[PDB]
Structure 1
Amino acid sequence: TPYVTKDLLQAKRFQAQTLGTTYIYDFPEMFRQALFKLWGSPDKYPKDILTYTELVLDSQGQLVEMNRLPGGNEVGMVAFKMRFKTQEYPEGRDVIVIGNDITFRIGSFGPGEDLLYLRASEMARAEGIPKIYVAANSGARIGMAEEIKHMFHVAWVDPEDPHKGFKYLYLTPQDYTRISSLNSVHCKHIEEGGESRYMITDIIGKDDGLGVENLRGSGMIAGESSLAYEEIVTISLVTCRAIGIGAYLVRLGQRVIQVENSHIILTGASALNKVLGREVYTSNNQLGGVQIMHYNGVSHITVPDDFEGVYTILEWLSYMPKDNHSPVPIITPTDPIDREIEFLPSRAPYDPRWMLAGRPHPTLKGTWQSGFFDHGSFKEIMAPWAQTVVTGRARLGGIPVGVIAVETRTVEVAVPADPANLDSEAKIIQQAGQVWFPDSAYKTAQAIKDFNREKLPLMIFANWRGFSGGMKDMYDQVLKFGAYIVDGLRQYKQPILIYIPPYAELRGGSWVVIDATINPLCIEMYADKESRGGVLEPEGTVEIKFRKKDLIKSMRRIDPAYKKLMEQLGEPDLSDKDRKDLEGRLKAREDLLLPIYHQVAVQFADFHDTPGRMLEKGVISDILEWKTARTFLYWRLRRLLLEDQVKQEILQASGELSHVHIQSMLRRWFVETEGAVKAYLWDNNQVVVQWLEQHWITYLKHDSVLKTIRGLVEENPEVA
């Protein structure tokens, strides 16, 4: 119709719709639409909720910010710089959005496409802001020298019988004359059958972007993506498909959102079928669809469509700092800090998500039974992979945290059949709760690294009996993956709060890999009054330390009947007949008592495993009560976050100062400005938070600068 407002990109939109995706130039508007929903209702939207520019390569291969009509791209990659207003950043946060244009040479990657990705990614890193990559591509571009394809000739073994084969390919002198100035081929001049021929030894092609230069280009952007993951927030959305380098780019950014019915693949199904010589695979989704990648941790989450993908991106960003040199964004909670937790962990197995997010009340219908974190704030990732562990993000009185919790129910995992292997059939496997398997140790380590790079505090609801130590799980390298937990926690740069909840336990190798001493500056450990911790289970401690001999020694000491029989069996003047009767009765009594005296010993061992011993031995900071634990940990975390902002300011003014020195300094400054009578209030987290907020070093700076300058002249006697 002539009355609506239309651009000239209708054909591109349609082409994108046919491939099951969104035209790249329509993504900015999706973000705006997603931002509005994220905000709520049209009563208090800000003025310019989203402003953006297109990032365009100039003649020198540098990016310039432009405001131009959509669809003007000369390479099959597009980039935007976007500023949007959110609850976390009402005055704006920036991101870089980079995306393949799947309507431009099927989203293949050539030199120009690679250069734009590189430059946009470099710009995200230089400014310290998140890089968002929209993946809809066909991998590295494939070409042939079109100007040679229909001019070459064949030197047959026998021109009257071509199935005998051919000796070489060649160009006639007339043809060589047409292309010798174009740098298209390398030829060797020869004579045969009395005719001059230009024998082909190499085909170069006069057009750029045919072959290996496309692989160099792919490697270039793989390296850049590897680096970006280390420096800034990286997120990808997979829509339609991600192939080859496209698949590696999404993996290297780590945080992957995959649209349902898309695929992440290296080589495709029909290619593999041709190589293997039979119809093995039914579909690319079979190789790299959500049912593979959501189930193995490559995909953090799945969405029904592009729009939910974009919305998901904004939700993830809402937990994260606006850039890599900013504090985590703490918002005003609506869920009160000073409330108890209504859901109570039990000895009986429960879904750990209820403890985090709460749940519908079991009896009082229409009511929510609150969990630990702020209502509605817990959002899980890598859910269907390695289900004995739970990983996600949440808010505690408004503070964004990474979250690790442990499943207590037995897990049923469906392992898919291998289509390439005749006798392989589908299996169901069971994984015991409260255990690290190779898969869940890996998921745990991954999550730790990802959250560290988002700069989040980490909350670990510890509940592990140990690692799976059986032959299969040992063969499958459980040991390698347990070690990554150590590396990950060691490298953590933000506070880590470890809490063993009611009826949870921390034992053996599971304690070891998460102990506070791995990162004494970040990690604090807490145990519920109803928790347990020790090298073994009490049943195991008894097996090693309180065996049959010891159980007998116990009966002798405390069972009246057993005591008498031993004392009767003492007398030497005793006949052979009385001796056989007494020791018969002693064995009878022994057999009646072993089972329960065994339980007594188990309880004896159980009393060594208490939070009480934990505290007395200094392996935890405090014993908590679940109902009031949300409140306590809120203030502890606030305090730790604030003390760290100060402590890092102290170090940029005097880098030499040890961490024990600084702790004493902060305490000293508190005592000066409140008085020695109030020094005990340093142990009060709420009071210290308030004090730091009211009081928000110059002298330290003077001395360290003067020390730096004296050193430089000491080391270099010229200069002055």
Structure 2
Amino acid sequence: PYVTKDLLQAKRFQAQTLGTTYIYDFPEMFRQALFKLWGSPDKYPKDILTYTELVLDSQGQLVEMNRLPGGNEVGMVAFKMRFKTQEYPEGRDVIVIGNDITFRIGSFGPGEDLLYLRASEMARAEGIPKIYVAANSGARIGMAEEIKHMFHVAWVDPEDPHKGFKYLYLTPQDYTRISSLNSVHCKHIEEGGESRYMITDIIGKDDGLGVENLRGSGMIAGESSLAYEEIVTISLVTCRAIGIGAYLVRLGQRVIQVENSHIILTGASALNKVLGREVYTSNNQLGGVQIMHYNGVSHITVPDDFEGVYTILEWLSYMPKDNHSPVPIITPTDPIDREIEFLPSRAPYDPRWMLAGRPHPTLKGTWQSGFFDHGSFKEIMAPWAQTVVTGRARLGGIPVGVIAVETRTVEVAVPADPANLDSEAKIIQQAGQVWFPDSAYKTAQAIKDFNREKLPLMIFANWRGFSGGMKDMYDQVLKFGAYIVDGLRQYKQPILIYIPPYAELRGGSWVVIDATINPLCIEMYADKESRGGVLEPEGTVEIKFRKKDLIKSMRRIDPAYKKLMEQLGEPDLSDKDRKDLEGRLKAREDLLLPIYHQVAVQFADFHDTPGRMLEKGVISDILEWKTARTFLYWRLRRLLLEDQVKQEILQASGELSHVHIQSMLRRWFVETEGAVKAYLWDNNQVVVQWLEQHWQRSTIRENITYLKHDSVLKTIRGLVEENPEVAVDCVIYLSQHISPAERAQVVHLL
């Protein structure tokens, strides 16, 4: 019963004027975004986008159907979508939930809450991404309207109402109507020898008025917490997100906020009324882009709903079809065999340029290539914690999370507090190559988030340590520093940490990143022109090469300081000669000392080389930036494949040792390829070529076959050994579905 002229036109106008998109016009928007991503009419596949509406049936379960648009029994709609993308030409599935803002200002009733619940639950059922379009007014609020205009007031003094009232009540005739409906609890009182029904509680005939709504928020709040742990969650904020709306967005983490919009818990109109003054001017003042985009809650901003949708697909580009598929590697137009044109220097630079490249400064149309595949690097949480840069990219078409360090002094404009006229906007300096509380957090968030995308991670390490002065310590830098340790510990994909040219990893920043946090996943590489150590060289000298040592160094190298020999060696004691040289030696001491300190600092530095890193087995290999792209490509591409064989199958069958499994994989290489060819196992490329002989009579799967079969041998032997009572009744179970021919085989054996 939904009419196009009547229902459709008006509802879209109603979303149009709210500055949002009517919920049933999003599927079509997704169709249009994909068409752009494919770049033409002549490059477009058959069914770019298939969808189906998820609809709650009479017993609160979802049922796929594709009725016409509109006509939804709750103010939320869900769709199961499939769309042919470049990473998945034969399709990838996805679930989109979103408020019908036209329906009761997008309020959250128990019915709405339920659909979102089942939609989310299903998404997790199939391990596929959950897109949520936030356009709402938070939990629904209501009263007992029925009873609102029945109740009478027992005044303390009917002449003077400034003197208040005793209670509220209903007369017997009033109560008789509402009696059986159990709308109202009230104690039968007999004031003035007259019968009244003194209200004690008000329930309401109608459902979805109060506390039930709050529970129903927490329910979908909870669900949304779990889903962030299990599947991909992306969220689009278009008109507004309030309270339960806001919390849903945030629990999903990844958030695309449209500019007009806001993300609030309590609106300015409200806050003004509680506080008592005109404190806040707008809802955009509280939770608009210029707050959330700048504090990390919103990962990225978009100018309109369409660029939202487009980013959603743009994000899903890097991420696996589901939470049991691998990351979509695509054939790159950007060559792996090339060099990186952009070189990072002792001159401070935007780390974006080394990642994504930049326009060639000394040329017209030329581009300076960065480390990643041209055009692939897409940043998130940019204006927050600008001391670190986080985002995703592609290396030879392999998707990957990126973590880079800013090397220019950053400034941050913390805004003045509107509930405090004794405050103003402050600007705060932030040093390059330093973890602050905000960078520490952002860095840990990126790690937490990317891990959930099953993405591999590339950290371009260049940190001198954590900020450690009072304010930053007070501001809990230590807590967030420790989450970097928590985050990498729990990572389950390859992490490649790489110190670039003229970059450095010093002290506590090395500690929270070191390979031994996650031996199975982390590999640490230093550039030929990088540095690393506990302290900086100046500091090492300050502690471990002090003045006493410096004068000794003089006593050795500097020939002039053989005044010392002249001093002590020959026995001659005169106030003249003995006191003369005594001051004259000090003379030279003073002249040489600052320059020997400069030597001392160089001596310190020569300890901090990648030369020594490799020697003390802390980094895997020493690289060269020009040819680092291609090295890390084949290494990344191998590690992904080794990881597939091991976890996916080998561990999903043998349940055997990780040290053991590495061996058993190499054991197979040497076994079929020969001992004479064994050395090549250390060559990344050749190993990838050999791996596809098995993965893509499979030398490797024929082995996994034998493992998983022999594994179920020991599994049934353990139970029957543990539980000899079952064995007898068990043989008859296996006999029901054995084999009529082999049934006699057994039937005669024992």
Q: 1:670-720: CA deviations, max 9, x gaps? A: 122222221111111110100111222222122211111011111112111
Are the structure 2 counterparts of residues 351 and 708 from structure 1 closer, same or farther at C-alpha, using a change threshold of 3 Å?
Answer: same
Matched-pair contact (CA < 8 Å) for 2:654–2:707? no
Q: CA deviation at 1:387?
A: 0.5
Comparing 645-654 with 710-719, greater Cα deviation is found at 645-654
Matched-pair contact (CA < 8 Å) for 1:273–1:279? yes
Comparing 664-673 with 243-252, greater Cα deviation is found at 664-673
Q: 1:202-245: CA deviations, max 9, x gaps? A: 00000000000000000000010000000000000001100000
CA RMSD of aligned residues (A): 1.7
Q: CA deviation at 1:6?
A: 6.2
Q: CA deviation at 1:586?
A: 1.7
Matched-pair contact (CA < 8 Å) for 1:569–1:579? no
Question: What is the number of residues matched between the two proteins?
Answer: 719
Q: 1:542-565: CA deviations, max 9, x gaps? A: 011000111111111111112225
Q: CA deviation at 1:18?
A: 1.3
Separation (CA, whole Å) in 1 of partners of 2:570 and 2:84: 93
Separation (CA, whole Å) in 1 of partners of 2:156 and 2:650: 79
Are the structure 2 counterparts of residues 7 and 355 from structure 1 closer, same or farther at C-alpha, using a change threshold of 3 Å?
Answer: farther
Matched-pair contact (CA < 8 Å) for 2:2–2:70? no
Separation (CA, whole Å) in 2 of partners of 1:583 and 1:151: 108
1:69 paired residue number: 68
Q: 1:529-587: CA deviations, max 9, x gaps? A: 10011011011100110001111111111111122255335544231122332222222
2:217 paired residue number: 218
Q: CA deviation at 1:653?
A: 5.1
Matched-pair contact (CA < 8 Å) for 2:572–2:578? no
Q: 1:84-110: CA deviations, max 9, x gaps? A: 001000000000000011101100001
Q: 1:422-467: CA deviations, max 9, x gaps? A: 3211111001000100100000000001000000000000000100
Matched-pair contact (CA < 8 Å) for 1:269–1:284? yes
Comparing 298-307 with 577-586, greater Cα deviation is found at 577-586
Matched-pair contact (CA < 8 Å) for 2:228–2:253? yes
Matched-pair contact (CA < 8 Å) for 2:391–2:401? yes
1:403 paired residue number: 402
SS at match of 1:167: strand
Matched-pair contact (CA < 8 Å) for 2:561–2:588? yes
Comparing 666-675 with 252-261, greater Cα deviation is found at 666-675
Matched-pair contact (CA < 8 Å) for 1:569–1:582? no
Comparing 578-587 with 482-491, greater Cα deviation is found at 578-587
Separation (CA, whole Å) in 2 of partners of 1:11 and 1:566: 103
Separation (CA, whole Å) in 2 of partners of 1:5 and 1:702: 61
Structure 1: runs of 5+ lacking an equivalent: none
Matched-pair contact (CA < 8 Å) for 2:54–2:65? yes
Separation (CA, whole Å) in 2 of partners of 1:251 and 1:177: 48
Q: CA deviation at 1:412?
A: 0.7
Q: TM-score, normalised by structure 1?
A: 0.98
Comparing 565-574 with 262-271, greater Cα deviation is found at 565-574
1:449 paired residue number: 448
Q: 1:153-175: CA deviations, max 9, x gaps? A: 11111111111111100011111
Separation (CA, whole Å) in 2 of partners of 1:592 and 1:616: 37
Separation (CA, whole Å) in 2 of partners of 1:98 and 1:3: 21
Separation (CA, whole Å) in 1 of partners of 2:523 and 2:644: 18
Matched-pair contact (CA < 8 Å) for 1:556–1:566? no
Runs of 4+ in structure 1 displaced over 6 angstroms? 2-7
Pairs within 5 Å for 1:118-517: 118-517=117-516
Are the structure 2 counterparts of residues 5 and 189 from structure 1 closer, same or farther at C-alpha, using a change threshold of 3 Å?
Answer: closer
Q: CA deviation at 1:4?
A: 15
Q: CA deviation at 1:195?
A: 1.8
Q: CA deviation at 1:491?
A: 0.5
Q: CA deviation at 1:652?
A: 4.2
Q: CA deviation at 1:655?
A: 3.7
Separation (CA, whole Å) in 2 of partners of 1:507 and 1:437: 15
SS at match of 1:187: strand
Matched-pair contact (CA < 8 Å) for 1:516–1:525? yes
2:725 paired residue number: 718
Instruction: State the identity %.
Output: 100
Matched-pair contact (CA < 8 Å) for 2:96–2:132? yes
SS at match of 2:197: strand
Matched-pair contact (CA < 8 Å) for 2:563–2:581? no
Separation (CA, whole Å) in 1 of partners of 2:597 and 2:566: 23
Matched-pair contact (CA < 8 Å) for 2:135–2:238? yes
Matched-pair contact (CA < 8 Å) for 2:236–2:257? yes
Separation (CA, whole Å) in 1 of partners of 2:282 and 2:578: 81
Separation (CA, whole Å) in 2 of partners of 1:508 and 1:683: 31
Q: 1:102-150: CA deviations, max 9, x gaps? A: 1011000010000000000000000000000000000000000000011
Q: 1:34-73: CA deviations, max 9, x gaps? A: 0100111111201110010111000100000111111110
Separation (CA, whole Å) in 1 of partners of 2:720 and 2:197: 71
Matched-pair contact (CA < 8 Å) for 1:405–1:462? yes
Comparing 140-149 with 690-699, greater Cα deviation is found at 690-699
Q: 1:488-513: CA deviations, max 9, x gaps? A: 00100100001000001111110011
Q: 1:177-198: CA deviations, max 9, x gaps? A: 1211111100111111232111
Are the structure 2 counterparts of residues 5 and 193 from structure 1 closer, same or farther at C-alpha, using a change threshold of 3 Å?
Answer: closer
SS at match of 1:615: helix
Separation (CA, whole Å) in 1 of partners of 2:5 and 2:183: 44
Matched-pair contact (CA < 8 Å) for 2:388–2:439? yes
Q: CA deviation at 1:366?
A: 1.0
Are the structure 2 counterparts of residues 712 and 322 from structure 1 closer, same or farther at C-alpha, using a change threshold of 3 Å?
Answer: same
Matched-pair contact (CA < 8 Å) for 1:555–1:563? no
Separation (CA, whole Å) in 1 of partners of 2:470 and 2:159: 66
Matched-pair contact (CA < 8 Å) for 2:555–2:564? no
Matched-pair contact (CA < 8 Å) for 2:391–2:403? yes
Q: 1:7-38: CA deviations, max 9, x gaps? A: 84110011111111110010000000001001
SS at match of 2:711: helix
Separation (CA, whole Å) in 2 of partners of 1:99 and 1:421: 37
SS at match of 1:163: coil
Q: CA deviation at 1:300?
A: 0.1
Matched-pair contact (CA < 8 Å) for 2:254–2:299? yes
Q: CA deviation at 1:651?
A: 3.2
SS at match of 2:585: helix
Matched-pair contact (CA < 8 Å) for 1:54–1:67? yes
- Please say if 1:520 is aligned against 2:556: no
SS at match of 1:700: helix
Separation (CA, whole Å) in 1 of partners of 2:450 and 2:2: 50
Separation (CA, whole Å) in 2 of partners of 1:664 and 1:633: 23
Matched-pair contact (CA < 8 Å) for 1:34–1:307? yes
Comparing 92-101 with 6-15, greater Cα deviation is found at 6-15
Separation (CA, whole Å) in 2 of partners of 1:409 and 1:633: 26
Comparing 178-187 with 91-100, greater Cα deviation is found at 178-187
SS at match of 2:195: strand
Q: CA deviation at 1:518?
A: 0.6
Matched-pair contact (CA < 8 Å) for 1:416–1:426? yes
2:614 paired residue number: 615
Q: CA deviation at 1:393?
A: 0.2
